[PDB]
Subunit: 296 residues, 4 copies
């Protein structure tokens, strides 16, 4: 027995930060949940009860608050990079910092057609996330993503031409409902360190916007041949609009809505072109995944 891999830290650290413009009086809020796990020469904490190598997770928690107090918390890619870099620069024996950040939505309220200076609404459970891995001597690897974006289209979704054998019962369809929870991730080119990350700061919010916009427009306008075909179109467009991204990954559940045959009741017609009332299925659900990169 020997330690082959190990990391530890503090998870689920909720953090809120407010910015107050003294000139305009407008306030802006940010809320996130942070997790920081460290790697390094810490094996002895596991094998010899040597806690001298342990930067207490409680201390990691304090550090998250302190860093948020002295640095911008947005874009999350930047905050994560600053936070991760701190650990590998401050502690000689810590060689990797793994920072995950989940950003919660606090959209400014519009009252009587005017943006309110200090009132916000949680419009959607959709999240914007980042996974920032700061590895000593190996720069900063960043994976940005949007998740929990739940959508549905009532038509212009099809699924036919699939393999049919003795295990097949699914009927081909040229008009079905398509609903999913979008989980899209774009992996950035490795960054040499904080300076390079900072040099590209504007691209983070811009690329998130691009990803979300491409996602929504493609979902709404593509007369889908399958979840697979539609998600690929999203990925290729995103790669074409941001050269600093290496790959785009999508994980999409096919949240099924089943037709309900009611012909047994007074010959009521509710299937095919007559389908109006459907039964949303909680489970099971198809799960379609794809990682798209640039061709050589």
């Amino acid at each position: 027995s020997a330690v082959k891999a190990a990391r530890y830290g503090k998870d689920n650290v909720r953090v809120y930060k407010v910015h107050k413009d003294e000139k305009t009086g407008v306030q802006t809020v940010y809320e996130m949940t942070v997790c920081v796990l460290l790697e390094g020469e810490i094996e002895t904490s596991y094998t010899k009860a040597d806690n001298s190598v342990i930067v207490a997770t409680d201390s990691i928690k304090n550090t998250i608050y302190i860093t948020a107090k002295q640095n911008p918390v947005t874009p999350p890619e930047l905050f994560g990079s600053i936070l991760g870099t701190h650990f590998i620069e401050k502690y000689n024996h810590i060689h990797a910092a793994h920072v995950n950040i989940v950003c919660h939505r606090w959209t400014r309220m519009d009252i009587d057609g005017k943006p309110h200076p200090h009132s916000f609404i949680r419009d959607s459970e959709e999240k914007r996330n980042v996974q920032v891995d700061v590895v000593e001597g190996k720069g900063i690897d960043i994976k940005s993503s949007l998740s929990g974006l739940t959508v549905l289209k009532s038509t212009n979704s099809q699924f036919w031409g699939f393999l049919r054998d003795e295990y097949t019962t699914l009927k081909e369809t040229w008009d079905r409902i398509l609903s999913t929870d979008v989980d899209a991730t774009w992996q950035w080119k490795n960054f040499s360190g904080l300076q390079e990350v900072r040099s590209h700061v504007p691209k983070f919010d811009a690329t998130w916007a691009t990803a979300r916009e491409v996602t929504l427009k493609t979902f709404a306008e593509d007369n889908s041949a399958s979840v697979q075909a539609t998600m690929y179109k999203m990925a290729e467009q995103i790669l074409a609009r941001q050269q600093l991204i290496e790959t785009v990954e999508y994980s999409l559940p096919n949240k099924h809505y089943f037709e309900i045959d009611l012909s047994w009741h007074k010959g009521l017609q509710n299937t095919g072109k007559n389908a109006e009332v459907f039964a949303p299925q909680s489970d099971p659900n198809g799960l379609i995944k794809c990682t798209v990169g640039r061709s050589s």
Copy 2:
């Protein structure tokens, strides 16, 4: 031993309905979760294993789909009334139908500044609900509500002047964060039956809008003296804008955001007027309730 009270039925029935305009091609979707519990001369099903008095919950499920297929599913107040009335009119021994409906949000997508004809987004977990109790010989009682409306204001919330004794540690404040999940219910005047409910149909969507609008504006503009004082203002305004409502009830959690003293670290100032980074508290939470009616 004897049955003092009893009701049974089907809960968590997911229902989706689509409307397709053949003229414009625009489609509109509706999704809800329905629960129908019946009351009546059914005691023998419990005491003598007499299932002859039982309208199978599976049949109640079928009835929900059938009713949704042959009637409008909006406003929910109407659908609930139609569904409830069906049970007490169809079965002589059933004297009460309790219908609960949770409406899920499927907001039409805007693509390139134009509303899309058949694509929707789940913008928020906020729900619009109704509890419709159809009692034979006693009309229809309806309670409408909005829930899961999560908001936050970064200032203009205060709390001072409260009772202070040996159990008190809370410091008075003239500037704090206020965040809550709004659960507001407006109880309608009893309706004599389906005809009367139908005669007031336009008022349901209109009153829901009023309640939501009053909620948001009051929350955003009231320099709150307490959750209690602010919620009362919301209630009185709603009662003043809809004569057919008898009471307005609010249940609001005070989702605390605690200041974080960081002065122990290099004299960092993060409290009082210097407070920027806060610790959102998952629990516990204050819970403030109030039912407001008209004065005599």
Copy 3:
């Protein structure tokens, strides 16, 4: 507009307490989640921004910890009564205290066939709860319950003889699966105050045990004619074994397990007497309720 009803306090207060026997070294842990809402002459806090009538919810939180420190936290019926009584005795303007307690399971671990002195396991999400309403001049009303007790029987459950009409599709069955999450509540005779509650302390744990035992044995041995018939048998037995209880209420979901016809695949037989593989249904679910009292 006027306040018709109002209550406020602190919800979701997590509390852990440990007892350490200095003689044996054996430690025993207790964990619960408490909610205390107060009623009284507090209308002005809502109508006039008068916080002088408000016992801060933060103070209510402190009081919960203090009371747990100076009193037994079990049985929950007792702790709830002590806590509720404190508020109506300490504050002249507070006339009702509503205490809800959810008790979490921390069962002592058995290691090598011997009970461990200080290690515990969360065996099941099943909870033991109490709702204690202390009303000045009207004694103490207590509702005890067990919830989250999930069970399943693979046979000896039937359902036939139910009403059949044009809305019915359910096939009669003489052998089906029955699974539910038991929520059982026994309402105690009103107690005049703390002294009377204390005089009956042993009966609380004893009655909870009786309720759980009757529930499990009846569920396992009754060749069920319906959920209704089986739950009634449980209720009548509990009432017969504890004279101080006035009513017993059950709320049981019928968590359906559907047969899967596989005859389309190589004539595979998986229905009726050949049924082996089933599809558990997440939703919808039947919901059966009954409140049983003593006959006159």
Copy 4:
């Protein structure tokens, strides 16, 4: 743009299976949730709308039921291997099958001290899982695990000697509460195919038992120097008791229970050796991970 990676299938497929002994009348139930994702020459389904390469996820669902009907569903390692092998043997273009199975607990009820023939109870949310990856030409890789095993010890947990600097506030302790949700995984040596997996069937249940037993005993008896030190002891013991396992991985959250200083209230002593009432913390939580292998 080109597909770099892709897999798809059906997730959250609930499955129940019952075994009925005609001789004794004793019935035994099994319930699980299955996910099967396939890999292979399917890129064209994403890039050219070529569904001919798609084995419908609905068909994958049917296959799960069929396989469960014609094969043992336990141990899960075996069922997963059989199911995964089916896909790569049946479809020439499918080269990998990824099978995840979550086993739910249905423990036989004991009534009056006797095991009941057909009644079960969900004793704990603890799960037994497997991840079976069947790769054509590369055998079968299996990762077995237990998760959701929630435990707590009230003493014999310590944490001192950790790094202390300007970010540290945590006080050293020689007596604290330790609670966690155990997630333990043991990775098996690669198996050449179904025959080899079948040849080791008895070892699966035996090793799961060993892992659970070592986990519970070590947690209860180790006067813990840290979560790190205690989890390592568990891992090394498991590796020493099953030669066919290559690594053991633990992921443990440190679910904090904070002391509550009540000295501000009548000098009440509730800290240090006087600590009785604690505040369980929902978040944040430490997260400690380690993968232990055999030394060379």
